[PDB]
Amino acid sequence: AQYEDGKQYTTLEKPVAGAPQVLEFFSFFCPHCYQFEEVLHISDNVKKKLPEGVKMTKYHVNFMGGDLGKDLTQAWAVAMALGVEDKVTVPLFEGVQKTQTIRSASDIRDVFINAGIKGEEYDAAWNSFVVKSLVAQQEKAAADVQLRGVPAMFVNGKYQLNPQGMDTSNMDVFVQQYADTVKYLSEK
Numbered sequence: 525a526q527y528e529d530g531k532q533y534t535t536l537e538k539p540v541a542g543a544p545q546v547l548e549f550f551s552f553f554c555p556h557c558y559q560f561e562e563v564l565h566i567s568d569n570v571k572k573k574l575p576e577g578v579k580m581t582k583y584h585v586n587f588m589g590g591d592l593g594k595d596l597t598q599a600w601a602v603a604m605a606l607g608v609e610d611k612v613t614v615p616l617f618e619g620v621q622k623t624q625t626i627r628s629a630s631d632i633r634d635v636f637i638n639a640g641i642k643g644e645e646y647d648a649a650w651n652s653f654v655v656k657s658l659v660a661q662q663e664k665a666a667a668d669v670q671l672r673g674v675p676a677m678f679v680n681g682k683y684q685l686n687p688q689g690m691d692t693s694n695m696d697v698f699v700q701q702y703a704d705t706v707k708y709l710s711e712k
């Protein structure tokens with residue numbers, strides 16, 4: 525077949541019931557995730573190839589960066605709770621990987637302050653139990669599939685994208701193959 529298990533995708537030996545339709549995992553310490561955001565725009569290109577209104581979910585992970593990696597998972601929960609993901613994603617990526625100006629939880633808070641989120645707004649969300657639950661939700665979704673690598677995308681809790689088996693000589697062809705595979709899997 526043109527799409528084959530082990531080539532463009534792999535199949536979960538333990539399917540995950542009730543999972544989101546399109547579930548992405550990333551880390552702000554993850555280099556390919558940086559490319560996926562700034563250079564390839566995987567999330568938007570996948571969204572444009574899927575039916576309108578399909579739920580897409582993106583979660584942060586703990587296993588990169590130690591203490592700060594967990595801080596970034598809590599900060600991502602704040603971003604999701606406040607709905608400011610589009611405002612903080614790029615400065616957080618660049619703060620961690622490009623300028624390396626993010627060395628503490630205070631530095632992460634500075635990114636939100638600079639993006640226009642009020643200090644009282646950030647601190648209240650950061651210490652809220654709604655955000656504690658969002659952190660637990662991110663951990664549980666990752667734990668359901670024993671996630672050891674990012675960037676990762678799962679479709680209907682059953683199929684995992686395999687970008688290693690996709691052509692990397694051309695950035696746009698890669699994105700197109702990636703998005704077309706997600707579409708194929710969503711119609712499975």
Ligand SMILES: O=C(O)Cc1coc2cc(OCc3ccccc3)ccc12
Pocket residue numbers: 556559674675687688691692693694695696698
């Ligand atoms: O292999 C891995 O650990 C998994 C993996 C995740 O995202 C990737 C992106 C890759 O290429 C992107 C690209 C495409 C065209 C031109 C430059 C870069 C390759 C591998 C992965």
